[PDB]
């Protein structure tokens, strides 16, 4: 999908993930290249923290959350720090006893 002087082939793109409130979020994606990338939610630079840890394995980016918070519900998007490619993703969180 050459668009702008790029040539990255998405081997294993992100897959829609749906879990209940609290569950441990997970998002793994592979690419035909070995380069670092960043994640973005609802069009914003996701924040990192003890709970939020972005693990990377060679040509694969993994992302899991300690507790699936309501905020999670939205649209996740990842992109390499070398190319201008973007991998869209959908997620949903089920309500629970923890509300109000």
């Amino acid at each position: 999908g050459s668009s702008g002087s790029s040539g990255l082939k998405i081997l294993t793109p992100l897959t829609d993930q749906t879990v209940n409130l609290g569950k441990e979020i997970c998002l793994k994606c592979e690419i035909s290249e070995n380069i670092p990338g960043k994640w973005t939610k609802n069009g914003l630079p996701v924040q990192e923290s003890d709970r939020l840890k972005v693990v990377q394995k060679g040509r694969i980016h993994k992302l899991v959350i300690a507790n699936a918070l309501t905020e999670d519900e939205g649209d996740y998007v990842f992109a390499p720090d070398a190319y201008n490619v973007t991998l869209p993703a959908k997620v949903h969180v089920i309500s629970g006893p923890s509300s109000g």
Side-chain angles (χ1 to χ4, degrees):
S2 184
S3 277
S5 188
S6 68
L8 186 71
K9 292 280 166 165
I10 290 81
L11 295 163
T12 308
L14 307 152
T15 59
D16 55 314
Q17 274 315 290
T18 301
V19 286
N20 310 62
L21 197 86
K23 280 287 275 282
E24 183 180 70
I25 302 298
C26 67
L27 296 169
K28 171 190 206 286
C29 57
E30 179 185 46
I31 47 175
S32 196
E33 199 65 288
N34 164 262
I35 64 150
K38 193 184 286 196
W39 303 70
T40 51
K41 179 171 193 297
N42 297 337
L44 89 85
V46 180
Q47 63 159 80
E48 285 184 278
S49 271
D50 80 273
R51 58 189 271 289
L52 198 151
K53 197 164 210 191
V54 178
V55 182
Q56 188 209 344
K57 281 288 186 168
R59 304 175 196 67
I60 302 173
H61 304 252
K62 186 194 294 282
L63 185 158
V64 306
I65 302 178
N67 288 45
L69 291 169
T70 55
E71 52 174 65
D72 88 302
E73 189 287 277
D75 275 41
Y76 283 76
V77 179
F78 162 110
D81 206 23
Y83 307 88
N84 176 58
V85 60
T86 56
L87 279 86
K90 202 166 285 204
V91 267
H92 292 293
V93 64
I94 305 169
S95 66
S98 285
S99 292

